[PDB]
């Protein structure tokens, strides 16, 4: 498949191990190929009865799948990861066509997807409860919840579908997944791959739709749980200037800047401000924008036209608020004529920024960098600590004392020093998709208090 | 202290390490000594501004307490458990006066309380994150959430206050605790004991009140999290009749039957029904009802008069629905004249019960046992499986095959065989009162995708 | 490949990713096809200089392999298990030819082998140290030991090689494996598979030899660690008689009884002695003896002629010690003429045994069952309590109390109820093949005592 | 109690909860007060029959202690730590009299001792096995080994006795402890405290003696396990010079330098050699030498006269090998006349050292520092890479990259950055003092291969 030719030719819901048209409607939405602006699908948003059919069908698959063993569930999930690995370029292509991120980034998304699949497969084989000890004992066993729902986002369509379904299925649950109406295509490749690996029909069902479809899923009595889905970058004078510039571009211009907790609030010390800016703008203007399916493309189009307009409005407002545009912030017309109707824009860098500007305190969700100058550590510590734990943060400095000091002081939950799985994350994520059943076995006689 | 003399003489809120009157009112409630019906306190339910003072004061204590080390937090919590242990009889007495459970049961409640305190003290000293490994590494650290709220119940006043505060404080959080308006007294002994062990002023604050006070706590922007707070018993013919009768009494008549997930739906096979019933009624009529502070008392009064009336209404309705009363189910007037105004009643046993009866499908929260006869395992499996996971269950049989078969088939989350801490519970409970902060330390150079 | 045709055609040592002849000699041994008595290989036992070549070559691979990430180690180990699975019938065939166990049992051994490979592959990806918190922190990291040595046995050649190398390589170690001189062939398929999966040359080397070779391995200064490699069955009257008979045969006659911790000391209550014995002898004489490569063979030949004589000698001694032979205990002459020189014997059952008999206090390591009668639970508890923790044990009873009670009193470490991976086993095994490096990072100033 | 008056007045073996004279002799040794040279005890080294009495008596306590619950074991161990805390000054005093370390350091040792006691007390309450799930399940349980043996050293007498007995007793083992014949006194305060906390008589027994006694302990068949008991400091120019000097003194002159893995091999860059050395010698000559029981003493006497001579002999050899003495390395004559026969020496600093010098490649186990100059990071990396994993190491640098990079390349197992419990250490130590008993519970029928 190449850019500018694909159209969806099959239904976009998935039930009983096959693609089906929604039995019920709650809206009608268009899916786009953002590189060209073409309509690749006009699909039906699922209604109440379609949601019920998917949840009932998933309840029937949960009964079979949960009664399987942890070793058998691991075997199938490893097979699914193998199929995702064998078909990575095909999946990344579909991911690019619908989402518009570069094939370079899409390949990484799928790598993370099947690595996550293998990870929770491993935990499903080695899953174990507790045994606690007058010769009597009790034991605990983790049990799946039943039918779970995963609500996807459009910036990482295939990856989020993988990261929500992998742990849920590993614990023995079924999942009804609702992709973002922007990106409905790639989620069915995963549903088809799960079925090819040997999951029962209905274990991973796909229902398309928007808010109404998502509301029906959350309200369903047979649904057990539902999984749903600014960050400052600080660069000191004692940092590795090269690593700070490279890290700055990696924090603002990956996936067209449409990433949660992006380092869009960049703090640079006055001592090394001109050197940083000059090197950032030069390397930013060298980023090749174009067809996502090209191996050298590092920035494709934005997700859709209304989002591109909302990003441009942020740049315009910043300009009228006193900010200076050094590059980008406007429509980009690529040489390729087949992309002429795509939603492209040049990555934007803004200088002369202030804390009162709206382009500093609002998530733009676009390729827009905000550079704010500061004098000393004291000033910059109190300007970027209004970030909540859910946000990320990053610091650049060649000092084991100064680094951890700022990372401790900051309230952000995911911090970075000089850049931007384990067991806990798996255990915590498995706990979200399971419940602990206790059993107390009295071997002797009962001691009555009466 | 003895029964029939205590009255509260000090304020019932706790702030800044001292008992204070609520700065704000949202109601006025009476606390009773249920053994005598006396009013031991008329206290003010906390209003919005009192809740705010308590949460602000707790926020100031969290800042000091969280900056302390896990070893220091463990030291103080162990000291608190020692003080609870040294003063167990004084605390159990206050617990009895206000709640009405026997001093026998109250002592067990406090044992569980300081054992829980020592447990989470231990986990606070040994708490640790993860270290994951091109020479670069990341680490995780558990951090307290801030100001937590614990909402107590009236059946286990001191124990719930301990089980909510122990893990919260162990992780470095502060807690504003709201006791049940029925049982406000004992929670301040814990707050006084925490302060005597060395917690900062405000770490464990107590605000009295009902729904309005609890709503103010949940709505407060500086509150990080809020902790809030029928089961079938199956007896087969191949069981130990003695252990099944003893287990049946222990599942219905502990804490006057005012326990969640009590085994009030008791299934007995037809083969051993008369033998079970005759032995149950004889031992039930031998339970001594009276002053909770007596060492031989096994059943005190119910929590308050409106609850006693609601329990009696359940017995009356069952009688008019065809159930047979074999003992109890009515007011009990003890010999002691000082208890003559207490809320006493004889424990009730009901035979000739049916699945359509309301006293079988509704939680009575009183000392009422419902015995239902069944022929075979098949019948009894499909009659008691309408219980949700949150409910408990119990089976009595001398068969390693038949026991686990019924415990597996049942959906109840906490099951018992022939009766009625570990690491997981602590880890899971600590996760509820904390968040995982990640740090990525890049030692080398940044690899730009561009 | 069929029975009676295979001869080794390639060298049987493995170094630098290829089969090599040992540069040094310490003996010359013959490997047999026990189904026919044929010599399938005459190989050179490795000397000191060959051992040094393998250990030096393994040290060079450890330097490369350890610098890989846990995700890369997992990826390669998952491929290795897939290749073992794709070639399971070829590996099981070679296993049968050299070892003589049934193709039915060999297939199970290799299933366990690649499942173990996937198991530790999973742990290699999720391996993590600890992060412990005056504002300073320390972290730990598990590190491979270096060059480890695995010493194999002849009863499970391919499985032991898999169970020793999988965890060692998963932690980042290299391994020089020394198969049993009886069964040298199958270990090289694993070495060939490891190299085909992508391990560096020298990561898994194979040196053949006996005690002298093993001494050179254990004495080598660059070797970090070395991994090296009677059980009672109690049957009560309340058991499932059929399951006790089937379990008894599965505890004595699997792998020609050449298994450690086999349930060869069988205690039977007097009430069900004749019924049990008659049914055991009936089913024992129905065990098909013959060519291991036949799908209906359930017992092949013993490992070699000197071992068959040693087992037969145990039967003869038992007869003159008072034991009664009900079946087997003698040579089995198959119809097939290619097997006429194989080391076959019929499975043996012995009654009227005593604890002072030599066939009761010594591990026969052959297909010989010893039936001992007992009166009560007390007697059999005091007759079987001379068992060490390292041995296994089994009980057959329909009593949740009597089972766990007898299993508790017994000293055996591995017990079975009514028959004969998790996370702990992996962690403990990983700890054997790794060491904990701690790092203390001082963020503040040093507190000098002086 | 003050220095120069104490003599032992009671027997120094401990059996059955009381001090006993050894029934058997294997030698007669003198214990000294190194501050004065006085003989505080002339005790009998235990023979074979005394060792047997202690091990048999310990086996009887293991039978009682192991049958206790983890909560009861925790309760008693928490009391033991409290008693150690209540008597810390008395224990530290006895520790000083016999060992000679400063009361300042002894107090820290005992803090670590009861903190360790509380640590494993916590793990004893929360100890749990595993529960692994064809509808059948298995469980594991950690069980004590039986009678364990702890062999103490003289540099940390009370701490080693605490760190060996705490985990052993927490897992349910008994322990027969053999102190170093140099320092036999303090180990009996712990035995007296254990008995006062409520351990059964014989759970912690103490047998005095040397190698012969230790051989009898290791050879005893009823003994289950036995627990038994140069490091470079690298200083770069970009470090906090003051913190590097303070850290250097803390790495050489704590406990009279009689510590394993002391940072005695000090590498200093040429750029900051004179400034570092001059500041180290200045602060070293300010270390107060004298009576260990004085609060301002930071260095007491060496352990005994033969050890002082062995340290002084190392200094003399270094001088004739080319080393330069800047301070210390000779006898220290205190003003106090009661200390005139003590084993004192001034702390020594050596410059102009080489790697071929004997005082650089041998552990002196005395207060002697070796300063080595180096040009670049590469040189010092290749000069200090002969260190074994068991040794410690330390680096001083203000570089998050250079620190972890040098700590990674180094082979030392315990590293320090800019200086010199968690869950893992406890679990691993508990695994040393326990074994895993597995149980497989078959719920269904047995699948016979025959
Ligand atoms: O883009 P977005 O940031 O709004 O993400 C919202 C996701 O959930 C869905 N959504 C929006 N409102 C919802 C609601 N009220 N309930 C359930 N899902 C909802 C959307 O379709 C989308 O998949
Ligand atoms: O007896 P109950 O079973 O109603 O327990 C409810 C507990 O929370 C409080 N409560 C009742 N309604 C509440 C609400 N809407 N919000 C917060 N707390 C509430 C009560 O005071 C009590 O402590
Ligand atoms: O049943 P077995 O004794 O035949 O198995 C013992 C295994 O260790 C090896 N072995 C025997 N003696 C040895 C020694 N002294 N040193 C090292 N390995 C030895 C053997 O090769 C064999 O693989
Ligand atoms: O520094 P060190 O050698 O003095 O410490 C060694 C410790 O083990 C003991 N020891 C010495 N030789 C021993 C042996 N052969 N067996 C058992 N213990 C021995 C000593 O008593 C001492 O407590």
PDB file of C-alpha atoms in Angstrom, chain D residues 217-396:
ATOM      1  CA  UNK D 217      29.888 -26.774  65.139  1.00  0.00           C
ATOM      2  CA  UNK D 218      30.309 -27.218  61.382  1.00  0.00           C
ATOM      3  CA  UNK D 219      30.724 -30.996  61.733  1.00  0.00           C
ATOM      4  CA  UNK D 220      27.622 -31.555  63.864  1.00  0.00           C
ATOM      5  CA  UNK D 221      24.976 -33.565  61.957  1.00  0.00           C
ATOM      6  CA  UNK D 222      22.083 -31.692  63.592  1.00  0.00           C
ATOM      7  CA  UNK D 223      23.435 -28.337  62.386  1.00  0.00           C
ATOM      8  CA  UNK D 224      21.505 -27.270  59.291  1.00  0.00           C
ATOM      9  CA  UNK D 225      23.561 -24.319  57.999  1.00  0.00           C
ATOM     10  CA  UNK D 226      26.539 -22.177  58.992  1.00  0.00           C
ATOM     11  CA  UNK D 227      26.844 -18.425  58.395  1.00  0.00           C
ATOM     12  CA  UNK D 228      30.457 -17.223  58.199  1.00  0.00           C
ATOM     13  CA  UNK D 229      32.239 -13.869  58.267  1.00  0.00           C
ATOM     14  CA  UNK D 230      41.770  -4.045  48.249  1.00  0.00           C
ATOM     15  CA  UNK D 231      38.782  -1.679  48.284  1.00  0.00           C
ATOM     16  CA  UNK D 232      39.689   1.473  46.309  1.00  0.00           C
ATOM     17  CA  UNK D 233      38.651   5.090  46.846  1.00  0.00           C
ATOM     18  CA  UNK D 234      38.896   7.226  43.697  1.00  0.00           C
ATOM     19  CA  UNK D 235      38.871  11.023  43.951  1.00  0.00           C
ATOM     20  CA  UNK D 236      38.566  13.184  40.834  1.00  0.00           C
ATOM     21  CA  UNK D 237      39.359  16.883  40.523  1.00  0.00           C
ATOM     22  CA  UNK D 238      35.726  17.956  39.961  1.00  0.00           C
ATOM     23  CA  UNK D 239      34.666  16.643  43.386  1.00  0.00           C
ATOM     24  CA  UNK D 240      33.681  18.536  46.525  1.00  0.00           C
ATOM     25  CA  UNK D 241      37.192  18.645  47.994  1.00  0.00           C
ATOM     26  CA  UNK D 242      35.905  18.934  51.578  1.00  0.00           C
ATOM     27  CA  UNK D 243      33.492  16.018  51.163  1.00  0.00           C
ATOM     28  CA  UNK D 244      36.302  13.963  49.615  1.00  0.00           C
ATOM     29  CA  UNK D 245      38.594  14.592  52.593  1.00  0.00           C
ATOM     30  CA  UNK D 246      35.850  13.830  55.123  1.00  0.00           C
ATOM     31  CA  UNK D 247      34.868  10.726  53.160  1.00  0.00           C
ATOM     32  CA  UNK D 248      38.494   9.604  52.990  1.00  0.00           C
ATOM     33  CA  UNK D 249      38.879   9.746  56.777  1.00  0.00           C
ATOM     34  CA  UNK D 250      35.557   7.931  57.224  1.00  0.00           C
ATOM     35  CA  UNK D 251      36.838   5.173  54.909  1.00  0.00           C
ATOM     36  CA  UNK D 252      40.119   4.469  56.724  1.00  0.00           C
ATOM     37  CA  UNK D 253      39.821   5.425  60.388  1.00  0.00           C
ATOM     38  CA  UNK D 254      36.443   4.075  61.531  1.00  0.00           C
ATOM     39  CA  UNK D 255      36.767   1.285  64.118  1.00  0.00           C
ATOM     40  CA  UNK D 256      40.551   1.825  64.143  1.00  0.00           C
ATOM     41  CA  UNK D 257      40.545   0.876  60.463  1.00  0.00           C
ATOM     42  CA  UNK D 258      39.659  -2.694  61.482  1.00  0.00           C
ATOM     43  CA  UNK D 259      36.797  -2.955  58.988  1.00  0.00           C
ATOM     44  CA  UNK D 260      36.374  -5.112  55.903  1.00  0.00           C
ATOM     45  CA  UNK D 261      36.106  -3.282  52.569  1.00  0.00           C
ATOM     46  CA  UNK D 262      37.571  -0.069  53.959  1.00  0.00           C
ATOM     47  CA  UNK D 263      38.491   2.561  51.400  1.00  0.00           C
ATOM     48  CA  UNK D 264      42.197   2.199  52.163  1.00  0.00           C
ATOM     49  CA  UNK D 265      43.483   2.391  48.563  1.00  0.00           C
ATOM     50  CA  UNK D 266      42.979   6.083  47.765  1.00  0.00           C
ATOM     51  CA  UNK D 267      43.550   7.342  44.220  1.00  0.00           C
ATOM     52  CA  UNK D 268      43.972  11.114  43.869  1.00  0.00           C
ATOM     53  CA  UNK D 269      44.313  13.072  40.633  1.00  0.00           C
ATOM     54  CA  UNK D 270      47.559  14.999  40.192  1.00  0.00           C
ATOM     55  CA  UNK D 271      45.677  18.301  39.834  1.00  0.00           C
ATOM     56  CA  UNK D 272      44.356  18.098  43.404  1.00  0.00           C
ATOM     57  CA  UNK D 273      47.052  16.035  45.116  1.00  0.00           C
ATOM     58  CA  UNK D 274      48.846  18.513  47.392  1.00  0.00           C
ATOM     59  CA  UNK D 275      45.631  20.290  48.413  1.00  0.00           C
ATOM     60  CA  UNK D 276      43.930  16.970  49.204  1.00  0.00           C
ATOM     61  CA  UNK D 277      46.901  15.415  51.018  1.00  0.00           C
ATOM     62  CA  UNK D 278      47.659  18.477  53.168  1.00  0.00           C
ATOM     63  CA  UNK D 279      43.997  18.706  54.198  1.00  0.00           C
ATOM     64  CA  UNK D 280      43.810  14.972  54.939  1.00  0.00           C
ATOM     65  CA  UNK D 281      46.905  14.996  57.161  1.00  0.00           C
ATOM     66  CA  UNK D 282      45.633  18.115  58.944  1.00  0.00           C
ATOM     67  CA  UNK D 283      42.275  16.533  59.804  1.00  0.00           C
ATOM     68  CA  UNK D 284      43.839  13.142  60.586  1.00  0.00           C
ATOM     69  CA  UNK D 285      46.101  14.579  63.287  1.00  0.00           C
ATOM     70  CA  UNK D 286      42.983  16.128  64.867  1.00  0.00           C
ATOM     71  CA  UNK D 287      41.389  12.716  65.530  1.00  0.00           C
ATOM     72  CA  UNK D 288      41.116  12.286  69.296  1.00  0.00           C
ATOM     73  CA  UNK D 289      42.716   9.030  70.486  1.00  0.00           C
ATOM     74  CA  UNK D 290      41.981   7.802  73.986  1.00  0.00           C
ATOM     75  CA  UNK D 291      39.551   6.017  76.270  1.00  0.00           C
ATOM     76  CA  UNK D 292      36.767   4.481  74.123  1.00  0.00           C
ATOM     77  CA  UNK D 293      34.181   5.374  76.775  1.00  0.00           C
ATOM     78  CA  UNK D 294      34.852   9.105  76.337  1.00  0.00           C
ATOM     79  CA  UNK D 295      32.264  10.899  74.219  1.00  0.00           C
ATOM     80  CA  UNK D 296      34.933  12.863  72.325  1.00  0.00           C
ATOM     81  CA  UNK D 297      37.077   9.820  71.508  1.00  0.00           C
ATOM     82  CA  UNK D 298      36.898   8.998  67.799  1.00  0.00           C
ATOM     83  CA  UNK D 299      39.622   6.314  67.764  1.00  0.00           C
ATOM     84  CA  UNK D 300      40.226   3.805  70.533  1.00  0.00           C
ATOM     85  CA  UNK D 301      42.862   1.096  70.815  1.00  0.00           C
ATOM     86  CA  UNK D 302      43.378  -1.731  68.392  1.00  0.00           C
ATOM     87  CA  UNK D 303      41.785  -5.063  69.210  1.00  0.00           C
ATOM     88  CA  UNK D 304      44.794  -6.696  70.894  1.00  0.00           C
ATOM     89  CA  UNK D 305      48.568  -6.387  71.151  1.00  0.00           C
ATOM     90  CA  UNK D 306      49.426  -8.941  68.401  1.00  0.00           C
ATOM     91  CA  UNK D 307      47.164  -7.039  66.016  1.00  0.00           C
ATOM     92  CA  UNK D 308      48.728  -3.671  66.863  1.00  0.00           C
ATOM     93  CA  UNK D 309      52.170  -5.117  66.139  1.00  0.00           C
ATOM     94  CA  UNK D 310      50.923  -6.526  62.832  1.00  0.00           C
ATOM     95  CA  UNK D 311      49.622  -3.099  61.770  1.00  0.00           C
ATOM     96  CA  UNK D 312      52.789  -1.320  62.915  1.00  0.00           C
ATOM     97  CA  UNK D 313      54.819  -3.927  61.039  1.00  0.00           C
ATOM     98  CA  UNK D 314      52.941  -3.006  57.864  1.00  0.00           C
ATOM     99  CA  UNK D 315      53.949   0.641  58.319  1.00  0.00           C
ATOM    100  CA  UNK D 316      57.612  -0.263  58.854  1.00  0.00           C
ATOM    101  CA  UNK D 317      57.646  -2.449  55.724  1.00  0.00           C
ATOM    102  CA  UNK D 318      56.078   0.360  53.680  1.00  0.00           C
ATOM    103  CA  UNK D 319      58.838   2.763  54.758  1.00  0.00           C
ATOM    104  CA  UNK D 320      61.594   0.445  53.531  1.00  0.00           C
ATOM    105  CA  UNK D 321      59.542  -0.081  50.343  1.00  0.00           C
ATOM    106  CA  UNK D 322      59.670   3.658  49.555  1.00  0.00           C
ATOM    107  CA  UNK D 323      56.491   5.000  51.173  1.00  0.00           C
ATOM    108  CA  UNK D 324      56.499   8.352  52.971  1.00  0.00           C
ATOM    109  CA  UNK D 325      54.906   8.725  56.410  1.00  0.00           C
ATOM    110  CA  UNK D 326      53.113  12.040  56.920  1.00  0.00           C
ATOM    111  CA  UNK D 327      51.557  11.234  60.314  1.00  0.00           C
ATOM    112  CA  UNK D 328      50.935   8.342  62.666  1.00  0.00           C
ATOM    113  CA  UNK D 329      52.124   4.811  62.067  1.00  0.00           C
ATOM    114  CA  UNK D 330      53.552   4.518  65.578  1.00  0.00           C
ATOM    115  CA  UNK D 331      52.602   3.945  69.203  1.00  0.00           C
ATOM    116  CA  UNK D 332      50.363   6.520  70.900  1.00  0.00           C
ATOM    117  CA  UNK D 333      51.126   7.117  74.581  1.00  0.00           C
ATOM    118  CA  UNK D 334      48.072   8.621  76.319  1.00  0.00           C
ATOM    119  CA  UNK D 335      48.377  10.898  79.326  1.00  0.00           C
ATOM    120  CA  UNK D 336      45.872   8.830  81.318  1.00  0.00           C
ATOM    121  CA  UNK D 337      47.876   6.274  83.357  1.00  0.00           C
ATOM    122  CA  UNK D 338      45.173   3.592  83.303  1.00  0.00           C
ATOM    123  CA  UNK D 339      45.522   3.452  79.496  1.00  0.00           C
ATOM    124  CA  UNK D 340      49.339   3.311  79.421  1.00  0.00           C
ATOM    125  CA  UNK D 341      49.292  -0.427  78.582  1.00  0.00           C
ATOM    126  CA  UNK D 342      46.600  -0.107  75.912  1.00  0.00           C
ATOM    127  CA  UNK D 343      47.120  -0.985  72.260  1.00  0.00           C
ATOM    128  CA  UNK D 344      47.071   2.528  70.842  1.00  0.00           C
ATOM    129  CA  UNK D 345      48.537   3.963  67.657  1.00  0.00           C
ATOM    130  CA  UNK D 346      48.151   7.214  65.769  1.00  0.00           C
ATOM    131  CA  UNK D 347      46.233   6.991  62.465  1.00  0.00           C
ATOM    132  CA  UNK D 348      48.672   6.804  59.575  1.00  0.00           C
ATOM    133  CA  UNK D 349      48.790   8.469  56.152  1.00  0.00           C
ATOM    134  CA  UNK D 350      51.157   7.184  53.451  1.00  0.00           C
ATOM    135  CA  UNK D 351      52.151   9.074  50.296  1.00  0.00           C
ATOM    136  CA  UNK D 352      54.390   8.273  47.316  1.00  0.00           C
ATOM    137  CA  UNK D 353      52.915   4.765  47.191  1.00  0.00           C
ATOM    138  CA  UNK D 354      52.923   2.330  44.271  1.00  0.00           C
ATOM    139  CA  UNK D 355      50.705  -0.561  43.213  1.00  0.00           C
ATOM    140  CA  UNK D 356      53.612  -2.999  43.702  1.00  0.00           C
ATOM    141  CA  UNK D 357      54.013  -1.951  47.346  1.00  0.00           C
ATOM    142  CA  UNK D 358      52.923  -4.502  49.933  1.00  0.00           C
ATOM    143  CA  UNK D 359      50.834  -1.899  51.794  1.00  0.00           C
ATOM    144  CA  UNK D 360      48.673  -1.422  48.681  1.00  0.00           C
ATOM    145  CA  UNK D 361      47.889  -4.999  47.660  1.00  0.00           C
ATOM    146  CA  UNK D 362      47.298  -6.359  51.185  1.00  0.00           C
ATOM    147  CA  UNK D 363      44.472  -5.572  53.605  1.00  0.00           C
ATOM    148  CA  UNK D 364      46.201  -3.992  56.602  1.00  0.00           C
ATOM    149  CA  UNK D 365      43.067  -4.066  58.816  1.00  0.00           C
ATOM    150  CA  UNK D 366      44.467  -1.063  60.662  1.00  0.00           C
ATOM    151  CA  UNK D 367      44.333   2.738  60.544  1.00  0.00           C
ATOM    152  CA  UNK D 368      46.674   3.196  57.571  1.00  0.00           C
ATOM    153  CA  UNK D 369      45.759   5.179  54.441  1.00  0.00           C
ATOM    154  CA  UNK D 370      47.557   4.731  51.108  1.00  0.00           C
ATOM    155  CA  UNK D 371      47.441   7.712  48.732  1.00  0.00           C
ATOM    156  CA  UNK D 372      48.196   7.001  45.062  1.00  0.00           C
ATOM    157  CA  UNK D 373      48.452   9.682  42.382  1.00  0.00           C
ATOM    158  CA  UNK D 374      46.995   9.233  38.903  1.00  0.00           C
ATOM    159  CA  UNK D 375      46.865  11.317  35.726  1.00  0.00           C
ATOM    160  CA  UNK D 376      43.613  10.493  33.910  1.00  0.00           C
ATOM    161  CA  UNK D 377      40.404   8.513  34.312  1.00  0.00           C
ATOM    162  CA  UNK D 378      41.739   5.811  31.977  1.00  0.00           C
ATOM    163  CA  UNK D 379      44.847   5.133  34.076  1.00  0.00           C
ATOM    164  CA  UNK D 380      43.004   4.839  37.394  1.00  0.00           C
ATOM    165  CA  UNK D 381      40.389   2.603  35.756  1.00  0.00           C
ATOM    166  CA  UNK D 382      43.081   0.132  34.656  1.00  0.00           C
ATOM    167  CA  UNK D 383      44.939   0.282  37.992  1.00  0.00           C
ATOM    168  CA  UNK D 384      41.913  -0.482  40.200  1.00  0.00           C
ATOM    169  CA  UNK D 385      40.219  -3.157  38.059  1.00  0.00           C
ATOM    170  CA  UNK D 386      41.979  -5.978  39.947  1.00  0.00           C
ATOM    171  CA  UNK D 387      39.299  -5.576  42.639  1.00  0.00           C
ATOM    172  CA  UNK D 388      36.995  -8.490  43.387  1.00  0.00           C
ATOM    173  CA  UNK D 389      33.211  -8.182  43.527  1.00  0.00           C
ATOM    174  CA  UNK D 390      33.163  -8.785  47.288  1.00  0.00           C
ATOM    175  CA  UNK D 391      35.064  -5.565  47.971  1.00  0.00           C
ATOM    176  CA  UNK D 392      33.623  -2.062  48.117  1.00  0.00           C
ATOM    177  CA  UNK D 393      34.603   1.055  46.190  1.00  0.00           C
ATOM    178  CA  UNK D 394      34.004   4.785  46.195  1.00  0.00           C
ATOM    179  CA  UNK D 395      34.169   7.669  43.718  1.00  0.00           C
ATOM    180  CA  UNK D 396      34.037  11.431  44.345  1.00  0.00           C
TER     181      UNK D 396
END
